[PDB]
Write a protein that binds this ligand. Structure first.
Ligand SMILES: NC[C@@H]1O[C@H](O[C@H]2[C@@H](O)[C@H](O[C@@H]3[C@@H](O)[C@H](N)C[C@H](N)[C@H]3O[C@H]3O[C@H](CO)[C@@H](O)[C@H](O)[C@H]3N)O[C@@H]2CO)[C@H](N)[C@@H](O)[C@@H]1O
Ligand SMILES: [Mg+2]
Ligand SMILES: [Mg+2]
Ligand SMILES: [Mg+2]
Ligand SMILES: [Mg+2]
Ligand SMILES: [Mg+2]
Ligand SMILES: [Mg+2]
Ligand SMILES: [Mg+2]
Ligand SMILES: [Mg+2]
Ligand SMILES: [Mg+2]
Ligand SMILES: [Mg+2]
Ligand SMILES: [Mg+2]
Ligand SMILES: [Mg+2]
Ligand SMILES: [Mg+2]
Ligand SMILES: [Mg+2]
Ligand SMILES: [Mg+2]
Ligand SMILES: [Mg+2]
Ligand SMILES: [Mg+2]
Ligand SMILES: [Mg+2]
Ligand SMILES: [Mg+2]
Ligand SMILES: [Mg+2]
Ligand SMILES: [Mg+2]
Ligand SMILES: [Mg+2]
Ligand SMILES: [Mg+2]
Ligand SMILES: [Mg+2]
Ligand SMILES: [Mg+2]
Ligand SMILES: [Mg+2]
Ligand SMILES: [Mg+2]
Ligand SMILES: [Mg+2]
Ligand SMILES: [Mg+2]
Ligand SMILES: [Mg+2]
Ligand SMILES: [Mg+2]
Ligand SMILES: [Mg+2]
Ligand SMILES: [Mg+2]
Ligand SMILES: [Mg+2]
Ligand SMILES: [Mg+2]
Ligand SMILES: [Mg+2]
Ligand SMILES: [Mg+2]
Ligand SMILES: [Mg+2]
Ligand SMILES: [Mg+2]
Ligand SMILES: [Mg+2]
Ligand SMILES: [Mg+2]
Ligand SMILES: [Mg+2]
Ligand SMILES: [Mg+2]
Ligand SMILES: [Mg+2]
Ligand SMILES: [Mg+2]
Ligand SMILES: [Mg+2]
Ligand SMILES: [Mg+2]
Ligand SMILES: [Mg+2]
Ligand SMILES: [Mg+2]
Ligand SMILES: [Mg+2]
Ligand SMILES: [Mg+2]
Ligand SMILES: [Mg+2]
Ligand SMILES: [Mg+2]
Ligand SMILES: [Mg+2]
Lengths: 157, 51, 234, 185, 148
RNA sequence: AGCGUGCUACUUAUACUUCACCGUGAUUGCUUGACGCUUUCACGAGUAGGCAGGCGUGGAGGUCAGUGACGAAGCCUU
RNA sequence: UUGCUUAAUUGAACGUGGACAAUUGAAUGAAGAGCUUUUAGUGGGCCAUUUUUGGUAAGCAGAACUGGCGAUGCGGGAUGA
RNA sequence: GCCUAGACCGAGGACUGCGGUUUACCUAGGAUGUUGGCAUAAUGAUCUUAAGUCGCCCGUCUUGAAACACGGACCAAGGAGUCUAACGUCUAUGCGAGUGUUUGGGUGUAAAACCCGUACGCGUAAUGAAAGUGAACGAAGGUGGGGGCCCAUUAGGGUGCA
RNA sequence: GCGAGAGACCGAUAGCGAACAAGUACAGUGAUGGAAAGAUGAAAAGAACUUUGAAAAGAGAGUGAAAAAGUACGUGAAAUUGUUGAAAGGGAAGGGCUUGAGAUCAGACUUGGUAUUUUGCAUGCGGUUUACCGGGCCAG
């Protein structure tokens, strides 16, 4: 621009940030999110898929299984804001989901042998409880879509 | 640097009015009144109804 | 080696500051107890006076009489008219009421002088009798003080004490009490308060503002509906 | 919009610095900018303000006025402060021993102060022996003896001096200054 | 310098500070002292009273050298005494030996009597003196000696 | 979807409320830049006109031991 | 105190000394009060409400107070000083 | 008192303050945590153009101009408050009851710089037509204010320039 | 008039009217009036020759540092105009704001750090790519 030289009093030190008081407090999920509830995925690859909710992970995401045999959607995480939580529920008191956490889904084609074995073991109990409710498998294996004249502000889920 | 409303920020409310804590503790905002069930208009105040 | 020199100096002065804050906070506790007691006494006398007036009304009803309420001593005045095309005398009157913008509010103690002042500003203002909660909400949300000619938020009782302690105002509740039940130092307390700058009403005005409240407009004395208006605008 | 009760964006109307670019005069204000900022002594705030004044606002102070100022009761050793030039007065019959602090001294003034046993110091030397202006006495020169003020506020029956280049009986003396030539104002 | 004048700041503004209605014209009101009795009467009467008319008597062939008579007051009279010898004189002057101050030789015609003299006899030589100047010189024990 | 009248909600000015940034005035403090740094508040329409702070040109004193035939100046160009 | 005034030791004006202390004698406000110098442009105006004169009246002519336009954009009156 | 949906914003930048829960921690003197994608690019700007909306030709005199008022077809270069004599206010500077070296003389590395002094101008006295006369009763005056300085000890007193 | 030395002056619409065959060309019966007009290049080396053409000329070629210097001559602006390319266009065109579309431009994998695979050089310096730490931007 111009011939104005920088001066000596124009320092280059970067100040430290002030001490912030934004201490995080835990997330509150919607009352409709109780483990075992069947959810509808709204975005992502598996959008429109009806899936079973299993556990609230500590990252604020939801652990979900298809089950993979019924749907092809595996055990994975979803965000609570991209899911419509219906009123259908599956008894997941008999499904052990303790070993699942954020590090389980840590970033490292093909699929780990541990994860496939866990998929089958979880899907066994989910399936055992799903068979009890008639058409629950058929419902979970079917994709969701809005028909003409479907008003989501008027529909019960 | 940033004005905070004491009617929204409880910490600022207690900073300005310490008695608000007692107001909250005693439910002064929903305090019942002890009195008898009376009706003192049975006589001449029924002149409101007609004349 | 300037690192350890400057670190030692802040930690020494930090410990000194910590000790000083301990003594200050211990001393400040008694003052906060004082203002706590003051607020409790004000609440008790408010409730007792209300119940006393209510009982007196019931008794007058019972005893074939009519309890005539004491006339209001305080009014809240809001300028709802813009700054253009104002005749000189009401313009001067509004300036002397510190109402120099639209949606500016001020507290007035009703005498005869101030009443005739408000009568001069009547076509341009909406005013009325404010409730205690309306006063508190105004002072808490939009209460500012005039300190060395600056508009400073009333965010701490120390500002109020430093400016109105010679008038026995040590808290925001002392100020609210002094305003509501018009006290011996109402003049100083209300002039220390910067004129309240309200927004437009949420819900709007009437269809046409600039006609008396009695004739379906907004100007003049609305008396107790100024509380609803302040709720709309504050 | 605002109904302004006063004019907006009004400068204070006072000098906040000398108009002079004399580097040594600004060093003295730098000393008294610090003194006015930090001593709470009213003397130092007056000196900082007086260093800003213009030439006509710093009239010369004769050494006779200081002599008359030293003749106040209980003032024989007060220190005289003149923010300006102290000039000599050859009409004095005698001068006392005195300490006078000034921006400038004329040759007659400096010789006469020192000849009579006194001191002629600058205002920075004052700020060390009297950083709060203790036991001082500020002397200001006559402001209204200036020639330009003779013509200020001229008008009929005002008694001021006309702005005129020549003086005599033929120069603005006939009509309006004499009843034999019409009127007098 | 032309660069500091307001002519440079008026460039770009139409009227150059002279007004759009009033405009800058050749000579509205006349030239010089025109109209001093008719439309500039209000100016000359207010600020230069006495301008019109004759007062007093004429003087054909006036030589100001005839009227040369510079004044020296009494409070400035001792400055004509030698500066290097003033202080001893202020002490040792008496009726028997007082300093002579030749005022004419310093360029003064009349000695006036403003101010106060040292309580010291002096001999003042002047062309003219006032009544009080000579009274003050005699009171301190001095004398005035007339010269030409 | 006209006339008189009542009611509920809604629409939107450079106006009002909260916030950001610019400038102006004031204001708090400050012992290798104090003609400087800093805290805070209020305010900002404008012809004629006044003042202030700046941008640009021919030439001049000083300086950059400044650029330049390995390309100055000028000229055209999302 | 006086050269003014009273029949006066009466008065007049200006004074010495003493008493009445912060509710020092209504309200509201006050980006503080007071003071000075110097100089520009301007010296065709017009409009609205109300008072109002001449005129049958006029988008006519003339006054009173205020507010405006002129000098001013913006939202509304479709459009319009 | 309690629950609940959305939008806009995130200025500041070690600590310092007021509070709350109890020499600890907090929501309490201004947004952080975490995850994904992108760095041949998501992101942003300009130019042209389309679309929506608004937008009358500038300058001028005028109460009033887009005017059916006047100049202007277009482009380049030139083009208009200057200098001088004498002055008013303000400001800076030097010296100061004085001040101004430059008419002139000296000198010179030669229209420069450096130096010199008698006079003279203005100032230091006014007033009267003029003859003329010509500025201290007093601490160069008194009273009411008056910054600053001094003695005090809220107050009060002393001294009080402009 | 003659002879000199200079300038904070002007720089070819300026400076005298004239920087040139300027008081010239030209006008007017006449007295008088009175311009425009400087720059190739260091040097003409001012383009031999061949070819097309009636010729001027054009095209090859040649000289030149440059012909993007050819006496139409340094640089060569704008108005105005031709061609090419891009685009728009129902009784104008032009403008502001906003975004789209196309074109252009900008920017952090930083002067990123650790080694490392692996290579050009003077044990060491520059590159490179894989890992980890961490960083930039846009977002949930
Ligand atoms: N001696 C008379 C004249 O003085 C002129 O010079 C005068 C001016 O240059 C200068 O003017 C000053 C002015 O600067 C200053 N700021 C105010 C002062 N009043 C003015 O002086 C003025 O008044 C005096 C009388 O008092 C007149 O003699 C003078 O002509 C007049 N200009 O003061 C000089 C005093 O005379 C010229 N040298 C010349 O015309 C002639 O000598
Ligand atoms: Mg609404
Ligand atoms: Mg504003
Ligand atoms: Mg005098
Ligand atoms: Mg008189
Ligand atoms: Mg004459
Ligand atoms: Mg008469
Ligand atoms: Mg006669
Ligand atoms: Mg201008
Ligand atoms: Mg202008
Ligand atoms: Mg123009
Ligand atoms: Mg002007
Ligand atoms: Mg004009
Ligand atoms: Mg004029
Ligand atoms: Mg005379
Ligand atoms: Mg309609
Ligand atoms: Mg209807
Ligand atoms: Mg805005
Ligand atoms: Mg402005
Ligand atoms: Mg030039
Ligand atoms: Mg130069
Ligand atoms: Mg070079
Ligand atoms: Mg170039
Ligand atoms: Mg004028
Ligand atoms: Mg005039
Ligand atoms: Mg007219
Ligand atoms: Mg006119
Ligand atoms: Mg006009
Ligand atoms: Mg307007
Ligand atoms: Mg409009
Ligand atoms: Mg209409
Ligand atoms: Mg930030
Ligand atoms: Mg676009
Ligand atoms: Mg339009
Ligand atoms: Mg015109
Ligand atoms: Mg006309
Ligand atoms: Mg026009
Ligand atoms: Mg027309
Ligand atoms: Mg006309
Ligand atoms: Mg005309
Ligand atoms: Mg034409
Ligand atoms: Mg033309
Ligand atoms: Mg002299
Ligand atoms: Mg004098
Ligand atoms: Mg006498
Ligand atoms: Mg020529
Ligand atoms: Mg010519
Ligand atoms: Mg040429
Ligand atoms: Mg041939
Ligand atoms: Mg070339
Ligand atoms: Mg060339
Ligand atoms: Mg060419
Ligand atoms: Mg072109
Ligand atoms: Mg057609
Ligand atoms: Mg784009």
């Amino acid at each position: 621009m111009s011939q104005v030289a920088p001066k000596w009093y124009q320092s280059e030190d970067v100040p430290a940030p002030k001490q912030t008081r934004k201490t995080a407090r835990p997330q509150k999920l919607r009352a409709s999110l109780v483990p075992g509830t069947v959810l509808i995925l709204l975005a992502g690859r598996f959008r429109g898929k009806r899936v079973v909710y299993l556990k609230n992970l500590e990252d604020n995401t939801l652990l979900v299984s298809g089950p993979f045999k019924v749907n092809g959607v595996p055990l994975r995480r979803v965000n609570a804001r991209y899911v419509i939580a219906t009123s259908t529920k599956v008894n997941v008191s008999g499904v052990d989901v303790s070993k699942f956490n954020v590090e389980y889904f840590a970033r490292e084609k093909e699929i780990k042998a541990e994860r496939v074995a866990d998929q089958k073991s979880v899907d066994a109990a989910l399936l055992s409880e799903i068979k009890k409710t008639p058409l629950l498998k058929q419902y979970l294996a079917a994709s969701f879509s809005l028909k003409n004249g479907d008003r989501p502000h008027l529909l019960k889920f | 640097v940033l004005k905070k409303n004491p009617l929204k920020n409880k910490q600022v409310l207690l900073r300005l009015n310490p008695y608000a804590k007692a107001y909250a503790a005693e439910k002064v905002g929903s305090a019942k009144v002890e009195q008898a069930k009376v009706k003192p208009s049975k006589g001449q105040f029924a002149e409101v109804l007609k004349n | 080696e300037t690192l350890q020199k400057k670190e030692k100096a802040q930690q020494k002065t930090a410990e000194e500051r910590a000790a000083a804050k301990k003594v200050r906070k211990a001393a400040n506790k008694e003052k906060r107890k004082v203002i706590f007691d003051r607020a409790a006494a004000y609440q008790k006398e408010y409730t007792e006076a209300e119940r006393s007036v209510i009982k007196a009304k019931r008794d007058a009803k019972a005893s074939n009489s009519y309890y005539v309420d004491a006339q209001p001593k305080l009014v809240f005045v809001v300028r709802i008219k813009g700054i253009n095309k104002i005749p000189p005398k009401p313009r001067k009157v509004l300036q002397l009421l510190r109402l120099t913008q639209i949606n500016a509010g001020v507290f007035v103690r009703l005498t005869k002088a101030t009443s005739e002042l408000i009568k001069l500003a009547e076509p341009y203002v909406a005013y009325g009798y404010p409730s205690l909660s309306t006063i508190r909400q105004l002072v808490y949300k939009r209460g500012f003080g005039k300190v060395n000619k600056q508009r400073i938020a009333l965010s701490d009782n120390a500002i109020i004490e430093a400016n109105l302690g010679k008038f026995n105002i040590l808290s925001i509740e002392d100020l609210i009490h002094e305003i509501y039940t018009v006290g011996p130092n109402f003049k100083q307390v209300s002039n220390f308060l910067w004129p309240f700058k309200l927004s437009n009403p949420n819900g709007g005005f009437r269809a046409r503002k600039f006609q008396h409240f009695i004739q379906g407009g907004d100007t003049g004395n609305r008396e107790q509906f100024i509380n609803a208006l302040v709720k709309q605008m504050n | 919009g605002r109904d302004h009760t006063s004019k907006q964006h009004v400068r204070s109307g006072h000098r906040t610095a000398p108009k002079s670019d004399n580097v040594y005069l600004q060093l003295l204000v730098k000393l008294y900018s610090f003194l006015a900022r930090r001593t709470d002594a009213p003397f130092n705030k007056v000196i900082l303000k007086s260093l800003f004044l213009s030439k006509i606002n710093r009239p010369p102070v004769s050494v006779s006025r200081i002599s008359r100022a030293l003749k106040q009761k209980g003032a024989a050793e007060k220190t005289i402060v003149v923010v300006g030039t102290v000039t000599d007065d050859n009409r004095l019959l005698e001068f006392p021993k005195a300490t006078i602090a000034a921006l400038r001294f004329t040759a007659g003034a400096k010789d006469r102060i020192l000849k009579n046993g006194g001191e002629a110091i600058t205002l920075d030397q004052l700020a060390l022996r009297a950083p709060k202006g203790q036991n001082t006495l500020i002397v200001r020169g006559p402001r209204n003896s200036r020639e330009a003020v003779r013509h200020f506020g001229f008008g009929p029956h005002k008694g001021k001096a006309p702005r005129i280049l020549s003086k005599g009986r033929k120069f603005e003396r006939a009509r309006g200054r004499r009843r034999s030539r019409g009127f007098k104002v | 310098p032309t660069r500091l004048t307001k002519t440079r700041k008026h460039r770009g503004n139409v009227s150059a500070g002279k007004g759009r209605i009033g405009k800058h014209r050749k000579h509205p009101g006349g030239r010089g002292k025109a109209g001093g009795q008719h439309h500039h009467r209000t100016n000359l009467d207010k600020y230069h009273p006495g301008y019109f008319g004759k007062v007093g008597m004429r003087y054909f062939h006036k030589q100001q050298n005839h009227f040369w008579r510079p004044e020296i007051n009494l409070d400035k009279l001792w400055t004509l005494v030698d500066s290097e010898k003033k202080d001893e004189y202020l002490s040792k002057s008496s009726a028997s030996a007082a300093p002579v101050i030749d005022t004419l030789a310093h360029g003064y015609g009349k000695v006036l009597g403003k101010g106060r003299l040292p309580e010291v006899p002096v001999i003042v030589k002047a062309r003219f003196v006032s009544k009080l100047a000579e009274e003050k010189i005699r009171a301190v024990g001095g004398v005035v000696e007339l010269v030409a």
